Each structure stands twice: as structure tokens, then as C-alpha cells.
């Protein structure tokens, strides 16, 4: 029944003391118990935590990064909320503070004395240094970055810096004998406030700190006017102009915990109790976000408003985001490596077969396109959000998830439409496809209204033509969110492996990976869903009209298809009627949006360019199409793109997911969520908040 205490790791005597005061006032409040371990630096608590010596530590975005690295694999449990001068935020701006009448601009720091919050931190290191890499004249990774910074600045205070090999990096630090340059508040020049005093005491000429730092130390506007900010456009703006004059906007500090057995619940209960009891003016007996004057930011960021629980899927990579990850990873990669990445396009293939095809595409493109892979579509989208992949073609259904996560539709799939297949395609207005409900003509007893208790074959959960459209219509007539109970048994890759929805799925050939939402599952997709109906594993298949047309009448000669005939199949019309597969225009459940390639709005324009070239060479009229590679063909397996894609067209203005998918379908997808939500969709609610 009983649950133990959160062991909090401290990095200095001042911090231990604060922690003890915290543990003490916590038990006096008859609230969750705390304990305080004692290590000498945040890097040490990362280590202490991963080895189960401790359980929690607040870390700056930059150390979150290091903490998540492989040997430790820690994850951000709770994110601090801050000032903002307006709306509280889980982000902040890194800025460069200098005194007035110093003269230099951002591009003239060579030879300046500089004060840093500490080695590895967002505003004090990762951000300023990545901004000045271009003036560092640094080989790249082989040669230690500290050797570069040490040669650029005349002397500095970068706590946690190697003062033995690079003493210029520790030179400005005031600290006693071995206190000097310490990676804790022992070194008076450590932290936002430390880097500030190092500036204000004339030890350094520029301070790399947070946007609040100046105001936290100079409560009087008259004092602040003796200071300015170095804007990345080589101008100097007042300290209150950080919104315009910052080197970057980084994610807030965060309480990190082990990925496995980290006791996130214990940690959250503790922190939730702490804000309520000792946060913003709650108490007077103890203030959580307040520290002694000698040393600031003890255990937590002084004057933070509180914390927000970080959902569970979120790891450090997603917590930090592409923009931050890239810049951090960039300080550990060569110039040739960084530029290489920026010029290629990394596609995210879902499952084993798409990856092979992607491999072909990479080799055949001379590496303009490289690949990244994952077992499911959500995983790929996360990859796009971490910045490890650049794009992927998605179904209307996942364009929604993608759009809720801030990704935008770049170009759309235009199936070999029919009017005039001249160069109309790239500018032909995308026209969608009809989602249909297919059944064997044989089973004539079956009508839309007798689906209850029947068996179902679905392309996948989350997908338009299958899932979203039928389930949307059904939820309207049954009023029930019990989706696994309408159809007696079903195959809907992506569902709970032990629920009826995964009952008719077959996995790969040796029957493994049953229900996986990727090609391994033979019943996955439009093709698989139709097959499920054909091999009589299910009674109704939710696919698009064309799927039948492409696998009957021998067009698909795979054994199971080979002998099929479009006559053996009929469609279920919403009005209880039944029309041949050809009458779909008057017998469909809906008109869906074509799949679309998505990426960060950031990479969209490049992505477009590489894609117009790639498809001009291997597309529908690709000269090297039959010859060396066809981007839109894959033997009826619809890998990477649908096999009937004529080309990837323009959006006709529909550049946001809402515009693209349209109002109705976006709404319809929202009603369904009343029943079920996804972990990615939530991780993103937090991140894009
Ligand atoms: Fe920071
Ligand atoms: Fe679809």
C-alpha cells in the first residue's frame, strides 16, 4: 500500500540546505516526503539518477539533452513555467547582455571577455557558441570545442569548463582555491545571476543569460538603462526588447527522471504539493521559488510560477524540439556534416518494405534523398518533430495528427485523374477519392443496416477511407464509443493486439506481427483490407472504390487476387441500397482528401524543389521510370505513395491542414476524439501550447 520518497539530488551546500528546508516544511505540512542526496554538479545528478542513487533534478534544456543520451536515458517529467511579461510560458529567450558604451556588436566578440552561465547550458553556452561558430575557425568535432572558445575569448567564466587544459575559460571566475570555476553555486559566477554579476563587476564585457536576468537583478529602470542587448543583426537594443533582440528561444528547464522505474507519479505528487503549498505567495514559512541572495536558482528557477506535467510519450528529443536539437547536435558535427544534412531530404519509411524501397530511391537519387524508418506512422511523425526525418506522405487522417503537431502539407498526391493527363497534374486541383464499403455480391442479405455483429476489414485505425469515415457515421447512429463491440470481429491494424479489432488480422507470412499498422501485416492498407474481404476473413471492407478495381479482373496476379472479378463485388450505399463497384459515385460513404506529403513549414520550400525534380525523373512520366526507378509504383503494395499516383501536385492555396482537409472532416475527426485520443496527439497538445 505505502509508496516511498522522492530522493532529490543537490549540487552544493547552499542547495542541500535549501532542500533540507524543503523536506522539513514538507513533513510539517503532512505532505509527500522528500530526501536530499548530495552530488557536486548537475552532470553528476544525471549519473546519480540513472544508477538509482537519486530520482529527480531540475535541469536546463541543455542538460536535459545530455541526460537523455544513451547511457543515462533520462526523461523530462515536469516543465517549469515562467514570467513572460505577459502570458506564463514554458519557453524563454536566450540573450546577450552588455553595458552601454562598449561598442562591439555580435559580430565583433573576438577578443572580448565573456561571462557564461555554465558549460552546456542553453543560454550560457549551446546558444551563444552555435551562433559564433562561424567566427570560431574551428575544425569541427575532432578538435575540442573548448579549445575553440578558449582561443576566441580573451578570458571567460564558463563554470564546469576544463580550467586545467583551458584556463582562459575559467580565468574570469572568482572562486576560492578549488572553488574557482566550480560547476555549482560555489563559483559565484555560476548561473544566470552569476554570469550577470561577472558582467556588472567589470570582469567580463558580455553576459550570456536569460531574458529576465537583468530585471531580476536591477529592479530599477534607471539601473537597467546602463545595459543593452546584442541583437543577432548586429545592432544593440534595450534590455526590454528581448522579444526582438535574442539569440534564440529555448524550452524551459525541467525535472527529469529515469525512463524506466523513475517514479514519475511520486515526483509529480511532490511537485504538485509543493506549488500549492509553497509556490507563488502561498506560504511564508517556506518559499519554493525563492533562494538566498548569496546564491540564486537553488533547486529551482527563482520566481518560476510553477510546473506543468509533461505527458508520458515525450522524451528529451521531442521535449526540446527540432530547432533546439539540431543546433545542439550541430556543435558536435562537422561543417561538412551539417551542410550535408541541410541539403538532402530524409524520408521516413513506415516498416520494412518501405525502407527497402526508400533505399532504392536513395541510391538512385545519388543521395539527394536519404531514409529514416519506424514501425508506425506516429513514430515517423515524431521523427519529423525531433528533426531526424524531413517528410512522409500521409493519409487525410494522419495529416490531422501532423497538423495538430504543427507540420504543414507541402504537396498532394494526384492519382491518375481523368480529364487530360497532359502537364495538368502538378496544377490539377486535387480531387480526392471516394471512400466505400465493399462486400461480396454473394452475401446479398447484407446491407449497411445489418453490419451490426458482422465482421470487418479496415485499412488501419486513424485512416480516412477505412476507420474515420465508417466509424464516424456509425458513432452517429449508435451514440456509442465502444468501437470494438459493433463489429463482431475485425482486423484494423493499429488496434489493441488483444481486442476484437485485431481478431482477423494475420501478420506477416510466418504469422508474426499480427495487427501492426504497417505493411508486415498482410491485411494492412487498402490492399490488405480488400484482401481480408476476399480471403473471406471479413464481411465488409472499408476501402476506396479504386482498390477493388486494381485487384480484381487479374490486374493483381498475386495468388489470392489473380482470379478476382469486379462482378463478385458490390458496394453498400448509405440508403440500404447496393450498387456494382462501378456505381460508387452514387454509392459511397464519403469523398476524402488525397494523401499529402508533410514537413515542418521550415523545410517545405526546399522539400518541394527536391520533390519536383525527383518525380520529374522517376514519376509517372519519369524517363527513368520503367528504366531505373518508378517512385509511384510498388507492385500493388502501395509503398511510400499509392501505386496510382500520377504526380505530387500543388495545394491550390490549402496550405494549412484545416484548409486542406476542410472544415467538416476536421470537425468529424474531433467528434470521434470524444471517444478516443492518441498519445502523439496529446504529447503535441502540451508541446504546441
Ligand atoms: Fe537555462
Ligand atoms: Fe486514404
UniProtKB/Swiss-Prot annotation:
GO terms for molecular function: metal ion binding; serine-type peptidase activity. Residues 6-333, 345-674 form the Transferrin-like domain. Its main location: secreted. The keyword Iron applies. Keywords: Disulfide bond, Glycoprotein, Hydrolase, Immunity, Ion transport, Iron, Iron transport, Metal-binding, Osteogenesis, Protease, Repeat, Secreted, Serine protease, Signal, Transport. Hydrogencarbonate 1 binds at residues 117, 121, 123-124. Its EC number is 3.4.21.-. The active site is at residues 73, 259. Fe(3+) 1 binds at residues 60, 92, 192, 253. Monomer. Found in a complex with LTF, CLU, EPPIN and SEMG1. Found in a complex with MPO and LTF; interacts directly with CP, allows Fe(3+) incorporation into LTF and activation of CP ferroxidase activity. Belongs to the transferrin family. This is Lactotransferrin. It comes from Equus caballus (Horse). The gene is LTF.
Amino acid at each position: 500500500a505505502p509508496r516511498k520518497s522522492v530522493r532529490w539530488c543537490t549540487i552544493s551546500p547552499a542547495e542541500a540546505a535549501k532542500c533540507a528546508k524543503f523536506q522539513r516544511n514538507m513533513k510539517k505540512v503532512r505532505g509527500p516526503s522528500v530526501s536530499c542526496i548530495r552530488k557536486t554538479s548537475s552532470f553528476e545528478c544525471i549519473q546519480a539518477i540513472a544508477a538509482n542513487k537519486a530520482d529527480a533534478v531540475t535541469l536546463d534544456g541543455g542538460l536535459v539533452y545530455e541526460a537523455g543520451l544513451h547511457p543515462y536515458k533520462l526523461r523530462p517529467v515536469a516543465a517549469e513555467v515562467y514570467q513572460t511579461r505577459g502570458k506564463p510560458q514554458t519557453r524563454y529567450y536566450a540573450v546577450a547582455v552588455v553595458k552601454k558604451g562598449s561598442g562591439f556588436q555580435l559580430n565583433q566578440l573576438q577578443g572580448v571577455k565573456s561571462c557564461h552561465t555554465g558549460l552546456g547550458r542553453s543560454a550560457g553556452w549551446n546558444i551563444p557558441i552555435g551562433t559564433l561558430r562561424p567566427y570560431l575557425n574551428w575544425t569541427g568535432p575532432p578538435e575540442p570545442l573548448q579549445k575553440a572558445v578558449a582561443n576566441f575569448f580573451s578570458a571567460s567564466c564558463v563554470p564546469c569548463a576544463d580550467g586545467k587544459q583551458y584556463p582562459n575559460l575559467c580565468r574570469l571566475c572568482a572562486g576560492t582555491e578549488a572553488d574557482k570555476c566550480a560547476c555549482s553555486s560555489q563559483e559565484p559566477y555560476f548561473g544566470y545571476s552569476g554570469a550577470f554579476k561577472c558582467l556588472e563587476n567589470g570582469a567580463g564585457d558580455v553576459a550570456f543569460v536569460k531574458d529576465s536576468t537583468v530585471f531580476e537583478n536591477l529592479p530599477d529602470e534607471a539601473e537597467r538603462d546602463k545595459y543593452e542587448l546584442l541583437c543577432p543583426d548586429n545592432t544593440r537594443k534595450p534590455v526590454d526588447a528581448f522579444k526582438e533582440c535574442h539569440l534564440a528561444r529555448v524550452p524551459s528547464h525541467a525535472v527529469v527522471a529515469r525512463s524506466v522505474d523513475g517514479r514519475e507519479d511520486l515526483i509529480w505528487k511532490l511537485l504538485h504539493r509543493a506549488q500549492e503549498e509553497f509556490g507563488r505567495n502561498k506560504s511564508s514559512a517556506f518559499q519554493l521559488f525563492g533562494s538566498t541572495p548569496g546564491e540564486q536558482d537553488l533547486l529551482f528557477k527563482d520566481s518560476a510560477l510553477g510546473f506543468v506535467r509533461i505527458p508520458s510519450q515525450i522524451d528529451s528529443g521531442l521535449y526540446l524540439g527540432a530547432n533546439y536539437l539540431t543546433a545542439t547536435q550541430n556543435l558536435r558535427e562537422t561543417a561538412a556534416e551539417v551542410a550535408a544534412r541541410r541539403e538532402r531530404v530524409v524520408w521516413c519509411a513506415v516498416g520494412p518494405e518501405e525502407e527497402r524501397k526508400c533505399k532504392q530511391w536513395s541510391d538512385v537519387s545519388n543521395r539527394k534523398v536519404a531514409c529514416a524508418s519506424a514501425s508506425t506512422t506516429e513514430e515517423c511523425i515524431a521523427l519529423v518533430l525531433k528533426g531526424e526525418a524531413d517528410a512522409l506522405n500521409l493519409d487525410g487522417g494522419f495529416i490531422y495528427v501532423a497538423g495538430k503537431c504543427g507540420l504543414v502539407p507541402v504537396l498532394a498526391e494526384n492519382q491518375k485523374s481523368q480529364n487530360s493527363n497532359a502537364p495538368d497534374c502538378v496544377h490539377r486541383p486535387p480531387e480526392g477519392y471516394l471512400a466505400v464499403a465493399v462486400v461480396r455480391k454473394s452475401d446479398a442479405d447484407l446491407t449497411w443496416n445489418s453490419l451490426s455483429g458482422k465482421k470487418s476489414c479496415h485499412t488501419g485505425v486513424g485512416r480516412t477511407a477505412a476507420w474515420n469515415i465508417p466509424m464516424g457515421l456509425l458513432f452517429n447512429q449508435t451514440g456509442s464509443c465502444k468501437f470494438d463491440k459493433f463489429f463482431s470481429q475485425s482486423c484494423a491494424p493499429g488496434a489493441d493486439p488483444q481486442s476484437s479489432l485485431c481478431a482477423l488480422c494475420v501478420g506477416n507470412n510466418e504469422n508474426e506481427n499480427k495487427c501492426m499498422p504497417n505493411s508486415e501485416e498482410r491485411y494492412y492498407g487498402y490492399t490488405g483490407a480488400f484482401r481480408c474481404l476476399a480471403e473471406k476473413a471479413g464481411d465488409v471492407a472499408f476501402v476506396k472504390d479504386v482498390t477493388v478495381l486494381q485487384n480484381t479482373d487479374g490486374k493483381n496476379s498475386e495468388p489470392w487476387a489473380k482470379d478476382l472479378k469486379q462482378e463478385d463485388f458490390e458496394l453498400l450505399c448509405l440508403d440500404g441500397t447496393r450498387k456494382p463497384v462501378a456505381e460508387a459515385e452514387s454509392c459511397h460513404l464519403a469523398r476524402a482528401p488525397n494523401h499529402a506529403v508533410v514537413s515542418q513549414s521550415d523545410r517545405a520550400q526546399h522539400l518541394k524543389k527536391v520533390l519536383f525534380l525527383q518525380q520529374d525523373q522517376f514519376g509517372g512520366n519519369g524517363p527513368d521510370c520503367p528504366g531505373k526507378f518508378c517512385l509511384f509504383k510498388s507492385e500493388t503494395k502501395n509503398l511510400l505513395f499509392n501505386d496510382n499516383t500520377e504526380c505530387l501536385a500543388e495545394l491550390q492555396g490549402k496550405t494549412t491542414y484545416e484548409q486542406y482537409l476542410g472544415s467538416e472532416y476536421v470537425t468529424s475527426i474531433t467528434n470521434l476524439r470524444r471517444c478516443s485520443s492518441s498519445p502523439l496527439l496529446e504529447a503535441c497538445a502540451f508541446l504546441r501550447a
